């Protein structure tokens, strides 16, 4: 299924995922498409900062959902 | 000046800081007192995930302010 990722500059990424993908898998796919290290990615959805070991289905991320991606150089 | 840090278990940390301290300095002080690596710390205040290179004064963190600390193993 297709999901989207929006960035702070207004850009949209499209990803091919499954509900059983983990957030780790999703960040890895963003690295595959756009070269961003997973450790620099914060994915945010429905008011929650997403955890790498949980799945898309855990967060009710569905076909056509849009995640918010914020990049970071250090933790915070 | 004195600020406080609240955790998800309900515990309170007390820190001695200055408005010109960076968030990096604050996380380093939490490591000094409690041994938590800065890379595992997320400090959250007034609806903002705080950035390591900004100062307490940038976020209007004041005497008696309480930050929210959420620990993470991987970026998320
Ligand atoms: Mg130290």
UniProtKB/Swiss-Prot annotation, chains A, B:
Residues 1-76 form the Ubiquitin-like domain. Changing residue 65 to D: Phosphomimetic mutant that binds and activates PRKN. There is a cross-link at residue 76 (Glycyl lysine isopeptide (Gly-Lys) (interchain with K-? in acceptor proteins)). The record marks 54, 72 as: Interacts with activating enzyme. Changing residue 72 to K: No effect on ADP-ribosylation. The modification (Microbial infection) ADP-ribosylthreonine is found at residue 66. The record marks 68 as: Essential for function. It is found in: Cytoplasm; Nucleus; Mitochondrion outer membrane. The modification Phosphoserine is found at residue 65. There is a cross-link at residues 6, 11, 27, 29, 33, 48, 63 (Glycyl lysine isopeptide (Lys-Gly) (interchain with G-Cter in ubiquitin)). The modification ADP-ribosylglycine is found at residue 76. It is a peripheral membrane protein. Exists either covalently attached to another protein, or free (unanchored). When covalently bound, it is conjugated to target proteins via an isopeptide bond either as a monomer (monoubiquitin), a polymer linked via different Lys residues of the ubiquitin (polyubiquitin chains) or a linear polymer linked via the initiator Met of the ubiquitin (linear polyubiquitin chains). This is Ubiquitin. The chain holds residues 1 to 76 of 229 of the full protein.
């Amino acid at each position: 299924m297709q999901i989207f990722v929006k960035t702070l500059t207004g850009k949209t990424i499209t990803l091919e995922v499954e509900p059983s993908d983990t957030i780790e898998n999703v960040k890895a796919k963003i690295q595959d498409k756009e070269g961003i290290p997973p450790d620099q990615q914060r994915l945010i959805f429905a008011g929650k900062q997403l955890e790498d070991g949980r799945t898309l289905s855990d967060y009710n991320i569905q076909k056509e959902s849009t995640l918010h991606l914020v990049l970071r150089l250090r933790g915070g």
